[PDB]
Assembly symmetry: C5
C-alpha cells in the first residue's frame, strides 16, 4: 500500500494532536524528560471512502497493516518511541481517524542561567517525510492537543502544553519534511532552595566573619579554614545536579564569590596578624574594624548587582 | 474481530481483578514502585456462546488471537506492562474468563510531610477506551482482588490492597473512557530512624552545647565549628533519599532548625568572648549561664511546636 | 492444543529440575539475585505416544508450538524469565522431555541480623496453574536438580542448591496451584570485614580514649571531636550496602554504641574540665583515671553481651 | 535474493551518507557517545531496472524484504544499531535509493592530555563485507553527509562532521571488507573550569602559603594540614570524570604538583619550628622569608613549563 | 530440519573461530567485560553437498532458516548474545561456512591479589549440546581465531587472544556437551597509580611522622588526627573499584598497615606527652627520638616483606 493520489497536485494534510497522560523523569544533567501520551493522526484517503448505501458498516474499523498509514516520527528522541495503536476508524468520506498511545524519552535542552528560579520550554518535534507520489504536510487539530489534569512533573509547575500551528516545511536529503513544534512550558518550584540550601550555606559564610571580632590568630585560622571545609562538605551534601554550561549561571557566580570571600577573609586574618606581630596594632585594629562593615556590605551589593544582571 | 454487539443499547461490562504476587522497588525520589501481579478480565460475548449439546467441549479454551479481547491499559505507568496471558476460557453463554500475569513500573506520587513517620496510598489506574460499535465500562469482581501473603515491600508495612468499585467514566479525544482506582495502602517502618539517624544527629548537636560550660574561645570555636562539620558529614553518610518538594517536610524543618542552632551557638560564643575581652565579664557570664538552659529549652519547645503542626 | 486427558481422574504430574549455570548480581539493598539456569520439565501425554513399529522415528523431536506444554512460571521474579527452549523429545510411551535455558532476576528477602557473619537461604518458587479439563501438580526429579562446579557468587560461599520435594498445593482465584521451593543456601565471606572495616573503625575510637591521659581541654576537644569526624568519614568511605530493616542488626547496635561512646567521652572531657576550673582537681583527676579502665572494660562487656544476644 | 551480477568483473559501489539528527550522551570515562542519524545507501541493480513504457509506475517503491539490500554495519559499536527503514525507491535504470533512521552507541577513544582544554575527533566506521558472487566497495556521497543545525553535545562545540572519501579496503577472514571513516570534530567548552574548578582550587593552596608569615607552629600545622583536607574534599566535590590513562595528563601533572606543594610546605613549617626550638632563629627566619617568594615563583614557573610541554 | 546423519557412527565436528572486533567495559567490581566479535562455524552436511555439473550455482548461499545450523551457545554470559548472521555459504562437498557478528557481556572472574600490578586471563566458553540422532563435538580453526589491531581495553594491555584446541567433552542432563576455552590475556597499566594514588597517599602518612620532631601535644594531636582524616578523604576521592574478596590483596594489606601506623603514632604522641607531664622527660625524649628512625624503617621493611609475599 502506498499514499492516496491527489485530485489535482495538492499535498496530503495530516492533522496531528498530542494529549499528555503521564509526564515524568526530567533529568537536569541530561536535559531529557520522559513522556507517555496519545498521538492523534487524521487524513483523507478516498480509496477507502465508501458508500453508506452498500457498505455493511457505518464506521469501518481497520488493523494498522490493512491500510496506508503516514510514517510520523519524533525529531528530538533518544531511540524511537514505544507506541501501541489504540484505534483506526474510517468515515464514509475516506477520513481516517488514527490514535496510538506512546512513551518516548525526549531530548530538549535547558537554560540554567536563572537557576534555581528558572523556567523552561520543553519541545516535542513531530516530523513527516514526504514520499515519491504524494508530498505530506502536518497540521494542528487544537481540539486533540491537551494534557491530563493529574500530570505531575516533580519540582516543576506545568504552565501549558501548546503547539505552534504553522509547520516548519523544509528540504532534507532531496525530500520535503514537515516539522511541528509542541511546546511544554514549565517553571521550577524554588521554595526548598531557600531554607535547605541558600540559608545554611549563608550561615557557614557568616560564621567565618566572626574572625573580625577576634585577635586570636589560632581562633581566626580555625574559623575561616574550618568554615571553608564545612562549605565544601555542605555543597557535597547538597549534590550537583547541573551539566557543564558554556555560559555563567546566577548560582555559578554566587558560589565563585563565596570561594573568593573565604580567600579574602584569610588575607585579612593574615594581614591583621602580621601587623600586630610587627608592632602596628592601630593598622591591625583599623583593618579588622573596617572588615566588620566591609565584608557584609560588599557581599550585599555584589549579590544585588548579580541578581540585577541575571533578572 | 471487533466487539460483541448489544441486545439493546447496553454498554459492555468488563469485570476486573488485580491480584498482587510480588511488590517491590519503591523509589522514594522517583515516586515509582514495581509490581508483578495477576490481571483478571471477564465479559460476555454471545458470538462464542455455544451448546453443551452439539459442541465437543464443555469449557472452550482459546488463544488470544482467536477471540476479541478488550484493550485494557494502565494510566500511571512508565512504559506499557510486560504481560503474559495465562488462560482464556469461554463458558457456553459466551462468558470469557481471561487471566494474565503482568509486571509494570507504576508512577504514584507520595506525601513526604510526615516523613519518616509517613503513610502512603499507592494507585493503580485501569482504563478501557470505548469503541465505534460498542461502549465499554469497567467493573470490580472483589473475589479476584487481593494480595499474596508473602508480598514484601522493604521498609514498609502493607496495610491493604483494595479497589474503588465505582469507575470514573469520562470523555477523552471524542470517546468514552472507564477508569478504575486500585489503592495500595502502605505505612513506613520508622524504627531504624531513631537509633541510626535521629539519636546520633542529636548527640553531635548536644556536643556543641558544651561550649556553654567553657570560657576558652579556642575550645568553643573548635566545639561549635567541628560539630557543624560532623553534622554535615553525618547527613552525607545518612544519604538523601527524598525529592525536591514544593511544600515543607517535618524532617525538612527540623534540619533547618539544627543549622540555625549551630549559627546561634557561634553568635553566643562570639558574644561571650567579645564582652570578656571588652572587660564586661558579668554580661559574658550571664549570657553563657542563660544559654545552658535557653538552648535545650528552646530546642525542646520548637520540636514540640513543629511535631504538633505536622501531626 | 489443550492438556492430555486422565485415564481416571488423576492429576498431571510435571517433574521439574533446575540446574544452575551462572549465578551472580546479589544486591543486598534490593534483596535480589540474578540467575542463569536450565529448567527441566517432564510429563506423559498419551496423545503423542506412538508405536516403534509404524513410526519412522525412534525418539520424536518437536517444536514448542506443535505440542501442548505446561505454563510453568516463577513466583518471586521481577519480570518474566528470558527462556530459550533447548530441546523437546517425545518417547514412544508419550513421555515428553522438555528443556530450556532461562535467565531471571529473583526477589528473595535477606536476614541482616547476624551481618557481616550472616548466612542466607535464597528461594526460587516454581508454580503451575491447574486448567479446566486437567489439574496440574509439580514434582522434583533430584537427578536434574544441581549446580555447575564453576558457579560463583562474589563474597559468598555457595553451600547447597536443593528443592523441597513436597509441593505446596493451594487454591488461588478459583483454581489450584502447585508451588515448589528451590532453596539456595549461601554463607557470607567475612574475612575482609576484620582488617578493612572493623579494625580501622576500632582504632579511631581507641584514639579518642587517649583524652583520659591528658588535662589539656584544647587537646581533648580536638581528640574526641576530630575522631568523631574521622569515624563518620570512615563510614562514608566503607559505603552503606544494607536496606532499612524493621528489626535491629548486630552491626546496627555496635554502630549506635560507638556514637554513644563518642558522646560519653565528650561528657567526661567536659566534666573533667569544669571540675578542674571550679577548683576540684581531685574529682577531675579521679574521673579521668577511672575512665581509663571504665571506657575499655564497659566497651568489651557491651560487645560480649551484644555478640551473645545475636549469636 | 543474492547480489546483482557484474557487466564485466567490476565491484558493486554502495554510495553512503550519514546525516546527524541527534547527538548526545558523551561519556568521558567510557569513551562512548550516542548518535541518532540517517543512513543513506545507493547502488545500481539492473535486475530491477524497468521500462517507463510498460511499467505502471514511474518510481517503484519497495519493502526491504522484496529486494536485495547490502549488509552494512558499524565497526566501533557496543551492540548493533536500532534502525528503522524510512524509504526504498528504485529508479528505472535500477538505481536503488535506500534510507533508514538509526540510533547507535559509538565507541570512539579520547585523548585526555590537554584536558580540560582538549579537542576530540570522534569516529563512526561504516563497513560492508564482500560476498561470494560480487565484491562490495563503499563510497561517499558528500551531498547526504551532514548534520542538523540544532545538534547539541553538552559541554562541547561541534566543529565538523565529515567523511574520509577514500575507503579502507582490506582482507578479513578470507573476504574483502570496505571501511569508511566518518569523523566528528568536537572542542571542549572550558569556561566553567576557570571560576568553578581552577580558581577555588588555587585559593585553598594559596591559604596554606600564609604559614610563611606566621611563627605559631600550632597555627601553621592547622593551616597546611586543614587546607590539604579542604583540597581533597574540593576534588571529591568537583567529581572525577576521566578514565585511567597510560599517559600523563596536563591536569594530572598539576594535581600531583599541588600534593607535592602541600608536602613541601609541611617540611618548611617543621624545619622553621625545629630550628626555632633548637635556638637558631636566624636560619628559621631566613627559610620562612625565602619561602614567601620561593613557593609562588617555583609554582608559577612549574605551571609555565608544564603548560609549554602540553601545549 | 534435523542434523546430518553419520557415514558410520562418527560425531559431527563443528570447527569454531572467534575474531575480536571491539572489546570494552571491563567492570572490575562485577568481574564482567563486554565483547563484540565474529563467530565462525564450519561443518559438513552431505545432504546439501551438490554436483558442480547440474547445480546452477558454484557456491550456494543460504538463509539461516533454510538449512540445519548447530545450536552454539556461550556458558559464562549474563543473557544470550545479540548475534546477526553475516553469511552462510555451502561448498559442493556439503561444507557449510557460517559467520555471524555477536555482542555479549561475558562473566569471567578476576584475581585481585597483585592489584594494581595484576594480570588477568579472561575466558569465553563456547558450548554445543549433542542431539538425539547425532552427537556434536567442537574444534578450533586457528586461521579464524584472532583480534583486530585497533581493539582497545582502557587501562589494560591486551597480551593475546587464543583458544585451548582440545575441547572439554562431558555429560550434562543425560546428553553430551563440547566446551571450548577462548582465553584473553590482559595486563593492567599501573603507571597512573604511582603519581596519582601511591605517592599522595604516602605524603599524607609522612606528614604525620613530623610529630616525632615536636613536643607540643596540641600540634601533635592536630598532626596525627588531621592527617588520618586527610587519608580517609583521599581514599574516598580515589574511589573504591574492587569487590569484597575472600583472600587478602597486596593493596588491601598496605592500607590496613597505614591505619595501624596512624594508631601507633597516636600511642607514641600520647606516651611522649604522659611521660613529659609525669616528670620523665628523658623517657619521653628517647621514645620520640627512636620513633624518628623506627616508624620509617619498620614501614620500609614491612612493605618489602609484603611485596615479597605477593610477588
Ligand atoms: Cl519516533
Ligand atoms: Cl499498560
Ligand atoms: Cl516467570
Ligand atoms: Cl551495526
Ligand atoms: Cl549465548
Amino acid at each position: 500500500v502506498s499514499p492516496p493520489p491527489p485530485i489535482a497536485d495538492e499535498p496530503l494534510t495530516v492533522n496531528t494532536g498530542i494529549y499528555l497522560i503521564e509526564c515524568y523523569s526530567l533529568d537536569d544533567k541530561a536535559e531529557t524528560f520522559k513522556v507517555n501520551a496519545f498521538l492523534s493522526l487524521s487524513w483523507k484517503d478516498r480509496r477507502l471512502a465508501f458508500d453508506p448505501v452498500r457498505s455493511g458498516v457505518r464506521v469501518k474499523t481497520y488493523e494498522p497493516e490493512a491500510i496506508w498509514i503516514p510514517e510520523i516520527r519524533f525529531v528530538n528522541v533518544e531511540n524511537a518511541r514505544d507506541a501501541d495503536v489504540v484505534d483506526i476508524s474510517v468515515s464514509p468520506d475516506g477520513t481516517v481517524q488514527y490514535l496510538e498511545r506512546f512513551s518516548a524519552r525526549v531530548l530538549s535542552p535547558l537554560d540554567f542561567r536563572r537557576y534555581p528560579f528558572d523556567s523552561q520550554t520543553l519541545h516535542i518535534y513531530l516530523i513527516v517525510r514526504s514520499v515519491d507520489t504524494r508530498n505530506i504536510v502536518l497540521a494542528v487539530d487544537l481540539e486533540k492537543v491537551g494534557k491530563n489534569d493529574d500530570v505531575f512533573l516533580t519540582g516543576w509547575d506545568i504552565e501549558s502544553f501548546t503547539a505552534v500551528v504553522k509547520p516548519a516545511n523544509f528540504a532534507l536529503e532531496d525530500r520535503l519534511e514537515s516539522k511541528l513544534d509542541y511546546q511544554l512550558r514549565i517553571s521550577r518550584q524554588y521554595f526548598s532552595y531557600i531554607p535547605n540550601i541558600i540559608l545554611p550555606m549563608l550561615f557557614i559564610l557568616f560564621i567565618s566573619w566572626t574572625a573580625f571580632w577576634s585577635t586570636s590568630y589560632e581562633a581566626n585560622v580555625t574559623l575561616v579554614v574550618s568554615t571553608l571545609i564545612a562549605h565544601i562538605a555542605f555543597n557535597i551534601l547538597v549534590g550537583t545536579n547541573l551539566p557543564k554550561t558554556p555560559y555563567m549561571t546566577y548560582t555559578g557566580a554566587i558560589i565563585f564569590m563565596i570561594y573568593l570571600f573565604y580567600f579574602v577573609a584569610v588575607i585579612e586574618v593574615t594581614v591583621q596578624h602580621y601587623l600586630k606581630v610587627e608592632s602596628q596594632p592601630a593598622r591591625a585594629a583599623s583593618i579588622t574594624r573596617a572588615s566588620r562593615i566591609a565584608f557584609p556590605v560588599v557581599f550585599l551589593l555584589a549579590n544585588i548587582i548579580l541578581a540585577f544582571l541575571f533578572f
